[PDB]
Amino acid sequence: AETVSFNFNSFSEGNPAINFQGDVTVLSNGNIQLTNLNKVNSVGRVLYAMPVRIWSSATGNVASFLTSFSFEMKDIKDYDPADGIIFFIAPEDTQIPAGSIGGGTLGVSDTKGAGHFVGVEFDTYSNSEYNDPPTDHVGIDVNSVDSVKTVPWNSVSGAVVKVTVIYDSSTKTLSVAVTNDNGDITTIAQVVDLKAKLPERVKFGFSASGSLGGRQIHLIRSWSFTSTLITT
Amino acid sequence: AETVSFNFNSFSEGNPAINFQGDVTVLSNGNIQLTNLNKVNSVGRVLYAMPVRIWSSATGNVASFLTSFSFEMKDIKDYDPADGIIFFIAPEDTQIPAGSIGGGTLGVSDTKGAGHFVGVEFDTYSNSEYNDPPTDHVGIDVNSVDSVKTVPWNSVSGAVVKVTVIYDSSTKTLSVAVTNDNGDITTIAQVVDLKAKLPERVKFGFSASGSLGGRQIHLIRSWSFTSTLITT
Amino acid sequence: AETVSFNFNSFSEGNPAINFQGDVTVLSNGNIQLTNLNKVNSVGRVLYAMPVRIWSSATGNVASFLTSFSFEMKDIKDYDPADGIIFFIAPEDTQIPAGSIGGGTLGVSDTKGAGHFVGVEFDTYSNSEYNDPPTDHVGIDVNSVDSVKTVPWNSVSGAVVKVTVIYDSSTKTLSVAVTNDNGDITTIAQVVDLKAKLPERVKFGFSASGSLGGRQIHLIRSWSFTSTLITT
Amino acid sequence: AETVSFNFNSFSEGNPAINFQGDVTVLSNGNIQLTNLNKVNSVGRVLYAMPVRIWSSATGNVASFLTSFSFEMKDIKDYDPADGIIFFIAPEDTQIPAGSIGGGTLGVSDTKGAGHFVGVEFDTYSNSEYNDPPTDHVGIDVNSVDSVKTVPWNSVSGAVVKVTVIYDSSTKTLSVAVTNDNGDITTIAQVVDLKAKLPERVKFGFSASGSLGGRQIHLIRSWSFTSTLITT
Numbered sequence: 070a071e072t073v074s075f076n077f078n079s080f081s082e083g084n085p086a087i088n089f090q091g092d093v094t095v096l097s098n099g100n101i102q103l104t105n106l107n108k109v110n111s112v113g114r115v116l117y118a119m120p121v122r123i124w125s126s127a128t129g130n131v132a133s134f135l136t137s138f139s140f141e142m143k144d145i146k147d148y149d150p151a152d153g154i155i156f157f158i159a160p161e162d163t164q165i166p167a168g169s170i171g172g173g174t175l176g177v178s179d180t181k182g183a184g185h186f187v188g189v190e191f192d193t194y195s196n197s198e199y200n201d202p203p204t205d206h207v208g209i210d211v212n213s214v215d216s217v218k219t220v221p222w223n224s225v226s227g228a229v230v231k232v233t234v235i236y237d238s239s240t241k242t243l244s245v246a247v248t249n250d251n252g253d254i255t256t257i258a259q260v261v262d263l264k265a266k267l268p269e270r271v272k273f274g275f276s277a278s279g280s281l282g283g284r285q286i287h288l289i290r291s292w293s294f295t296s297t298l299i300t301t
Numbered sequence: 302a303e304t305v306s307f308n309f310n311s312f313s314e315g316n317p318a319i320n321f322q323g324d325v326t327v328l329s330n331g332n333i334q335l336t337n338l339n340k341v342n343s344v345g346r347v348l349y350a351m352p353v354r355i356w357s358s359a360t361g362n363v364a365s366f367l368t369s370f371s372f373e374m375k376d377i378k379d380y381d382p383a384d385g386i387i388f389f390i391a392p393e394d395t396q397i398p399a400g401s402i403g404g405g406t407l408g409v410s411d412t413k414g415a416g417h418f419v420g421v422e423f424d425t426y427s428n429s430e431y432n433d434p435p436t437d438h439v440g441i442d443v444n445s446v447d448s449v450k451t452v453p454w455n456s457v458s459g460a461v462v463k464v465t466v467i468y469d470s471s472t473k474t475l476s477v478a479v480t481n482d483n484g485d486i487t488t489i490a491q492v493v494d495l496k497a498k499l500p501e502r503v504k505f506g507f508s509a510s511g512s513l514g515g516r517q518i519h520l521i522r523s524w525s526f527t528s529t530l531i532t533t
Numbered sequence: 534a535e536t537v538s539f540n541f542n543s544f545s546e547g548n549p550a551i552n553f554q555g556d557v558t559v560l561s562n563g564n565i566q567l568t569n570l571n572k573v574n575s576v577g578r579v580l581y582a583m584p585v586r587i588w589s590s591a592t593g594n595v596a597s598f599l600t601s602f603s604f605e606m607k608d609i610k611d612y613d614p615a616d617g618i619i620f621f622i623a624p625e626d627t628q629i630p631a632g633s634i635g636g637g638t639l640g641v642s643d644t645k646g647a648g649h650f651v652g653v654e655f656d657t658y659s660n661s662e663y664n665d666p667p668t669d670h671v672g673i674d675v676n677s678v679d680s681v682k683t684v685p686w687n688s689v690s691g692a693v694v695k696v697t698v699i700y701d702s703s704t705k706t707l708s709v710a711v712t713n714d715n716g717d718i719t720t721i722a723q724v725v726d727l728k729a730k731l732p733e734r735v736k737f738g739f740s741a742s743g744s745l746g747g748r749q750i751h752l753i754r755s756w757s758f759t760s761t762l763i764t765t
Numbered sequence: 766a767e768t769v770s771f772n773f774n775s776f777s778e779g780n781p782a783i784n785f786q787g788d789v790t791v792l793s794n795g796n797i798q799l800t801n802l803n804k805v806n807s808v809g810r811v812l813y814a815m816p817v818r819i820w821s822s823a824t825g826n827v828a829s830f831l832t833s834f835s836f837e838m839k840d841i842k843d844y845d846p847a848d849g850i851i852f853f854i855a856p857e858d859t860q861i862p863a864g865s866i867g868g869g870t871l872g873v874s875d876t877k878g879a880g881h882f883v884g885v886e887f888d889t890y891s892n893s894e895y896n897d898p899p900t901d902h903v904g905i906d907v908n909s910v911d912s913v914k915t916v917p918w919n920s921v922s923g924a925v926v927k928v929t930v931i932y933d934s935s936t937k938t939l940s941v942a943v944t945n946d947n948g949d950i951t952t953i954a955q956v957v958d959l960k961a962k963l964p965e966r967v968k969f970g971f972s973a974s975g976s977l978g979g980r981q982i983h984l985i986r987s988w989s990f991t992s993t994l995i996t997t
């Protein structure tokens with residue numbers, strides 16, 4: 070088979086394996102701070118430098134992958150806790166949308182919240198302009214921040230969250246498991262046809278944004294990944 | 302919410318948190334050995350002592366759970382590697398099935414292969430008698446050792462395996478992810494209405510079995526489980 | 534190591550994790566009410582279903598635990614505020630003591646005040662019969678409602694109390710810390726060889742009681758416990 | 766009674782309630798980083814600005830106090846993970862020891878490892894000059910980094926540790942509970958007569974340190990404190 074795997078217990082802004090886009094910045098403790106606190110419409114993104122072949126136009130096969138990461142969101146005084154983080158998969162040439170308003174677009178969509186990407190957002194602000202549920206939530210996005218599905222969730226300031234994703238090729242079922250601070254788990258699943266919505270060669274990564282009045286600390290602590298494509 | 306969460310990195314007899322049914326023997330290194338090598342038809346199971354209420358006849362809700370565990374199956378000179386391990390869910394009153402012999406009921410069914418439980422199997426020996434695919438496989442059993450679905454897997458002697466399982470309360474999707482020694486990941490997923498096959502209170506555990514000519518060591522090295530039942 | 538850890542921010546009947554002995558009634562708001570207000574000699578207890586092995590006859594070791602919980606005791610027109618709540622440890626086979634009447638056995642002892650258990654009491658009514666200090670107090674009981682040690686405390690109707698308990702495996706020191714509504718903290722500590730007073734397997738819970746003339750509401754709002762038993 | 770209490774969920778540089786002594790620095794996410802990864806014998810300390818009256822001259826009374834905090838230590842490449850963190854209590858005019866060598870001294874002792882303070886160290890480097898145990902440990906210090914008592918412990922790089930301390934005046938008992946990322950809890954208690962080892966007015970705080978090759982990320986994330994002195 071064709072297997073891809075990596076593991077980051079910490080980061081550094083000189084590692085060739087990571088692509089930094091936007092106001093991204095690496096802290097002294099090894100964490101990645103996606104957005105700039107005192108910047109209007111801040112947008113930061115981070116992608117694994119190397120492109121993962123998730124499916125073969127040849128065989129007709131699709132890869133299965135298991136990844137898990139942990140992040141932290143914290144409130145900053147006088148500023149609305151927004152907008153959130155999103156784990157995304159996109160074509161290898163993915164860029165921050167030209168003139169991106171930031172905020173509710175999470176840095177992977179245009180003003181009408183559209184774009185070419187599949188992702189799991191950890192939304193902390195309700196954008197009626199995107200059909201956002203009235204409360205914090207977790208969602209499965211498929212080429213739009215107007216989630217195909219969401220599940221109520223609760224963002225605790227300054228608490229480390231742990232996430233475990235699984236994509237089973239056979240069923241094209243993307244399943245998420247989120248371990249909240251109080252021990253409680255939150256799950257959400259959706260059937261997404263990756264071959265159908267993305268190219269053979271893509272890229273994974275994290276993005277986060279905010280507005281002028283909406284800002285908060287977005288930190289990625291660790292990230293491990295392993296994809297496996299059957300070649301037969 | 303109502304959440305159950307335990308974690309075992311080692312084991313030891315006498316712990317009130319675990320019930321040992323069968324030829325289960327705890328090694329002097331905190332490892333659980335499921336079957337007796339010197340017996341014909343050995344059978345052993347390890348269960349988490351307390352019944353966990355997976356769904357509520359009142360809420361109508363069904364819990365989601367995130368459980369991951371590791372095991373090892375080493376071969377033994379002049380013996381067919383069998384029958385394999387199995388992670389399962391059963392009615393709180395679950396008694397250990399009748400030991401059988403040439404058989405491979407994985408310790409959860411009768412000679413015919415029937416039984417009241419739902420589980421993920423890591424089978425290493427084919428039995429025309431239960432539709433066992435030609436080779437080693439990972440399956441999804443629902444009241445029968447004749448898996449509902451199966452996927453090609455390969456068991457490697459003396460290799461430690463890591464397994465992450467996720468269950469989505471809504472989508473009723475059971476998603477497994479097998480991480481092998483070399484790195485490659487195997488995954489399978491299936492819908493199983495837990496509220497349709499199991500009583501409100503069930504029990505989680507691992508089971509194994511052997512035959513007259515099929516035997517091997519079945520080691521459960523670690524186990525961590527977490528389930529959350531929304532009720533409101 | 535061998536660790537037990539649960540967490541309840543709310544309660545609900547039917548949860549297999551908790552056993553209800555006596556006049557325990559679960560409110561429609563996830564709160565536990567220990568005594569019945571319309572009964573003479575009400576008595577109620579709530580216990581964590583599974584027995585926790587506090588010490589090993591093999592290791593000689595004794596587990597340490599960190600448990601914290603919150604409660605509330607509101608008065609009721611024309612009634613003496615009593616008897617108080619109590620956090621205790623008992624032999625796994627613990628039955629609920631005989632309901633008594635003028636009495637104040639806190640639901641863990643006989644008419645005389647004897648019983649097999651060890652606990653921290655939050656007593657709000659003096660009984661010359663058991664040496665109750667002149668006023669409200671927090672005590673450390675060891676097989677007797679006649680506290681081994683006591684410290685002046687003051688119970689305030691309708692106030693939510695936070696309590697953090699720590700037990701050191703070695704020093705055999707049980708240390709309580711009562712946080713009142715206004716802020717002030719009350720603390721008491723006592724050596725109690727858990728391995729000397731209790732059998733290997735015990736049970737943790739909260740108990741309460743009332744009299745003919747003494748009654749009040751006893752609410753257990755939340756509970757989080759964690760114990761670790763070193764074994765190697 | 767006289768009670769002192771505060772609570773921090775994140776710190777800031779321009780906060781007169783906190784005294785920053787040494788290589789201290791406050792990250793963008795509100796955490797405090799006690800040492801500088803680039804200096805040689807980097808020493809950092811942070812004290813609560815206002816002094817606390819732990820014992821009354823008039824009345825041979827001493828205060829009880831409850832406090833809990835969480836930290837994170839991480840390994841930095843090419844440097845030994847050292848030296849650790851310490852929660853200390855010192856006279857209100859306390860400073861960094863003249864010409865401190867940092868390292869084994871944890872920034873609160875001279876070269877012989879002596880000074881004026883009562884602390885709880887989370888040691889990560891075995892120094893034979895201070896009779897350190899051979900493994901990571903938690904210790905109780907009384908005017909010397911040569912612990913009056915210690916307990917084996919394990920520091921995990923990048924993991925959030927939660928700590929809870931309780932000091933009972935009546936017993937002059939100091940008990941700690943450390944909650945590892947693991948879920949496991951480590952404990953350690955010691956009887957320290959504060960009035961006998963410290964001045965009426967003290968200051969509480971944290972500290973960390975490193976050497977030439979011994980360096981790591983030391984971070985304080987939160988800190989809550991309450992102390993109540995009886996005055997009758």
Ligand SMILES: [O-]S(O)(O)c1ccc(-c2c3nc(c(-c4ccc(S([O-])(O)O)cc4)c4ccc([nH]4)c(-c4ccc(S([O-])(O)O)cc4)c4nc(c(-c5ccc(S([O-])(O)O)cc5)c5ccc2[nH]5)C=C4)C=C3)cc1
Binds near residue numbers: 126127128
């Ligand atoms: O007549 S026989 O019976 O004998 C017989 C002859 C040939 C075959 C082979 C074959 N491919 C081989 C290699 C190979 C492997 C190793 C070595 S070696 O190790 O070096 O020796 C040498 C050669 C090989 C290497 C790369 C590819 N094949 C790639 C490919 C290209 C580009 C990319 S890309 O874009 O990513 O660069 C990605 C993948 C493709 N192959 C197909 C394809 C196909 C499927 C469906 C449809 S359709 O029906 O239309 O859907 C259309 C086309 C077929 C159909 C038959 C077939 N490939 C599509 C893409 C070796 C044999 C089988 C039997």
Ligand SMILES: [O-]S(O)(O)c1ccc(-c2c3nc(c(-c4ccc(S([O-])(O)O)cc4)c4ccc([nH]4)c(-c4ccc(S([O-])(O)O)cc4)c4nc(c(-c5ccc(S([O-])(O)O)cc5)c5ccc2[nH]5)C=C4)C=C3)cc1
Binds near residue numbers: 301
């Ligand atoms: O009749 S006979 O008995 O005579 C007989 C004749 C031919 C065959 C073979 C064959 N493939 C071989 C290699 C091979 C192995 C080792 C070496 S060696 O190392 O040199 O030894 C050299 C060559 C080989 C290597 C790689 C591939 N084949 C790849 C492939 C390409 C790209 C990728 S990827 O992932 O990189 O993109 C992954 C996989 C493919 N092969 C097919 C394919 C096919 C399937 C379905 C459909 S259909 O359903 O109709 O669409 C259309 C086509 C067939 C059908 C028959 C067939 N391949 C599709 C992809 C060797 C033999 C078997 C029996």
Ligand SMILES: [O-]S(O)(O)c1ccc(-c2c3nc(c(-c4ccc(S([O-])(O)O)cc4)c4ccc([nH]4)c(-c4ccc(S([O-])(O)O)cc4)c4nc(c(-c5ccc(S([O-])(O)O)cc5)c5ccc2[nH]5)C=C4)C=C3)cc1
Binds near residue numbers: 330337375
């Ligand atoms: O009937 S016969 O005469 O035919 C006959 C049948 C079977 C046996 C064997 C046997 N083990 C073998 C290997 C082996 C050797 C060489 C190769 S080869 O070189 O590759 O060929 C391959 C395999 C082998 C390899 C590893 C082990 N055995 C391990 C083990 C597992 C896991 C770990 S771990 O955890 O560290 O990973 C560490 C160690 C154990 N084995 C026991 C054990 C046992 C003891 C006491 C109790 S009790 O009663 O409860 O006290 C319960 C169970 C028995 C009982 C019988 C028995 N093992 C416990 C642990 C080969 C044969 C002997 C005779």
Ligand SMILES: [O-]S(O)(O)c1ccc(-c2c3nc(c(-c4ccc(S([O-])(O)O)cc4)c4ccc([nH]4)c(-c4ccc(S([O-])(O)O)cc4)c4nc(c(-c5ccc(S([O-])(O)O)cc5)c5ccc2[nH]5)C=C4)C=C3)cc1
Binds near residue numbers: 341400401402513
């Ligand atoms: O229900 S199930 O389907 O699950 C099922 C459950 C159990 C069984 C088996 C069984 N024995 C086997 C072998 C075996 C055969 C072939 C190979 S192989 O060749 O490798 O294939 C490997 C192993 C096997 C080999 C040797 C023996 N059994 C010997 C024995 C040992 C030593 C000597 S001696 O004296 O010579 O040393 C003499 C005899 C005995 N076996 C019994 C015995 C018994 C007799 C009377 C009474 S009672 O009435 O109470 O008195 C009580 C019990 C039973 C009862 C059941 C039973 N044996 C008594 C002695 C294989 C299976 C089968 C099916």
Ligand SMILES: [O-]S(O)(O)c1ccc(-c2c3nc(c(-c4ccc(S([O-])(O)O)cc4)c4ccc([nH]4)c(-c4ccc(S([O-])(O)O)cc4)c4nc(c(-c5ccc(S([O-])(O)O)cc5)c5ccc2[nH]5)C=C4)C=C3)cc1
Binds near residue numbers: 560561562
């Ligand atoms: O026999 S008699 O006739 O004599 C008789 C004896 C006792 C009662 C009372 C009673 N409540 C009172 C106050 C009260 C009265 C007067 C003053 S005064 O004005 O000062 O005098 C002050 C306070 C009072 C105040 C607040 C509440 N009660 C709240 C409550 C609190 C918080 C929240 S929350 O979540 O919003 O925080 C939500 C709800 C609840 N009360 C119930 C409840 C219940 C219903 C169904 C189910 S079940 O079917 O099982 O589901 C379970 C439980 C009952 C059942 C009987 C009953 N309450 C559930 C919630 C006073 C009397 C009635 C008649």
Ligand SMILES: [O-]S(O)(O)c1ccc(-c2c3nc(c(-c4ccc(S([O-])(O)O)cc4)c4ccc([nH]4)c(-c4ccc(S([O-])(O)O)cc4)c4nc(c(-c5ccc(S([O-])(O)O)cc5)c5ccc2[nH]5)C=C4)C=C3)cc1
Binds near residue numbers: 562566571752
């Ligand atoms: O026999 S007699 O005639 O003498 C007689 C004796 C006792 C009673 C009372 C009583 N409650 C009173 C107050 C009260 C009123 C005014 C003041 S005053 O203003 O100070 O004067 C002070 C105090 C009072 C205040 C708050 C409550 N009661 C709350 C409550 C709990 C929790 C919360 S909260 O928010 O924490 O959740 C909020 C509210 C509850 N009360 C019940 C309850 C109950 C119902 C069903 C079931 S069951 O069997 O299960 O169906 C079990 C239990 C009963 C049953 C009898 C009863 N309450 C459940 C919740 C005053 C009297 C009436 C008559």
Ligand SMILES: [O-]S(O)(O)c1ccc(-c2c3nc(c(-c4ccc(S([O-])(O)O)cc4)c4ccc([nH]4)c(-c4ccc(S([O-])(O)O)cc4)c4nc(c(-c5ccc(S([O-])(O)O)cc5)c5ccc2[nH]5)C=C4)C=C3)cc1
Binds near residue numbers: 573574632633745746
């Ligand atoms: O073991 S312990 O020590 O714990 C202990 C446990 C229980 C008891 C009590 C008790 N009753 C009390 C009051 C009371 C007194 C004073 C005040 S106060 O003054 O306010 O303080 C407050 C409350 C009290 C008031 C009214 C009644 N009791 C009424 C009653 C109600 C209504 C009417 S009516 O018809 O007029 O409406 C008529 C009679 C009855 N009581 C019984 C009865 C019984 C009789 C025969 C049979 S059997 O032989 O089996 O058939 C079965 C049961 C028993 C058995 C035990 C018992 N009552 C039958 C009717 C106070 C305590 C004492 C000690």
Ligand SMILES: [O-]S(O)(O)c1ccc(-c2c3nc(c(-c4ccc(S([O-])(O)O)cc4)c4ccc([nH]4)c(-c4ccc(S([O-])(O)O)cc4)c4nc(c(-c5ccc(S([O-])(O)O)cc5)c5ccc2[nH]5)C=C4)C=C3)cc1
Binds near residue numbers: 822823824
């Ligand atoms: O017999 S009579 O009935 O006539 C009678 C007369 C006097 C007393 C009082 C008393 N103190 C009062 C205040 C007070 C309170 C409120 C207000 S008001 O609210 O303003 O009105 C006004 C005044 C008061 C305020 C501050 C102090 N007292 C301080 C003090 C000073 C400095 C500090 S410091 O360091 O923090 O600055 C800390 C503490 C001390 N007081 C003693 C002390 C003592 C104990 C043991 C020993 S020994 O045996 O040697 O051990 C030596 C000394 C005694 C002994 C008796 C006594 N104090 C030691 C320190 C009010 C009355 C009782 C009975």
Ligand SMILES: [O-]S(O)(O)c1ccc(-c2c3nc(c(-c4ccc(S([O-])(O)O)cc4)c4ccc([nH]4)c(-c4ccc(S([O-])(O)O)cc4)c4nc(c(-c5ccc(S([O-])(O)O)cc5)c5ccc2[nH]5)C=C4)C=C3)cc1
Binds near residue numbers: 821823824997
């Ligand atoms: O004749 S009678 O019998 O009738 C009789 C006469 C006098 C007394 C009183 C009394 N103190 C009062 C206040 C008071 C209360 C409220 C207000 S109000 O608010 O205005 O109303 C105003 C004043 C009062 C306030 C503060 C103190 N007293 C403090 C004190 C100071 C500083 C601190 S601290 O912590 O801040 O440093 C903490 C505590 C102390 N008081 C003593 C003390 C003592 C103990 C042991 C020893 S010995 O063992 O011998 O050494 C020697 C001395 C005594 C002995 C008797 C006595 N105090 C030691 C410290 C009011 C009355 C009682 C009965």
Ligand SMILES: OC[C@H]1O[C@@H](O[C@H]2[C@H](O)[C@@H](O)[C@H](O)O[C@@H]2CO)[C@H](O)[C@@H](O)[C@H]1O
Binds near residue numbers: 152174196282284
């Ligand atoms: O409040 C956070 C929220 O802001 C929205 O945009 C606001 C903008 O922040 C505010 O300054 C302006 O006056 O009105 C805008 C429209 O509500 C973002 O659109 C949303 O995504 C959050 O970031």
Ligand SMILES: OC[C@H]1O[C@@H](O[C@H]2[C@H](O)[C@@H](O)[C@H](O)O[C@@H]2CO)[C@H](O)[C@@H](O)[C@H]1O
Binds near residue numbers: 845870
């Ligand atoms: O190894 C960490 C350890 O260092 C000790 O000091 C060393 C110093 O780090 C090294 O660079 C120098 O060459 O020798 C010194 C003497 O051992 C510290 O004393 C100790 O506390 C740790 O920080």
Ligand SMILES: [Ca+2]
Binds near residue numbers: 152193194195201
């Ligand atoms: Ca949003």
Ligand SMILES: [Ca+2]
Binds near residue numbers: 424426427428
């Ligand atoms: Ca089989």
Ligand SMILES: [Ca+2]
Binds near residue numbers: 637658659660
């Ligand atoms: Ca009492």
Ligand SMILES: [Ca+2]
Binds near residue numbers: 849869889890891897
């Ligand atoms: Ca040291």
Ligand SMILES: [Mn+2]
Binds near residue numbers: 202206208214
């Ligand atoms: Mn959304």
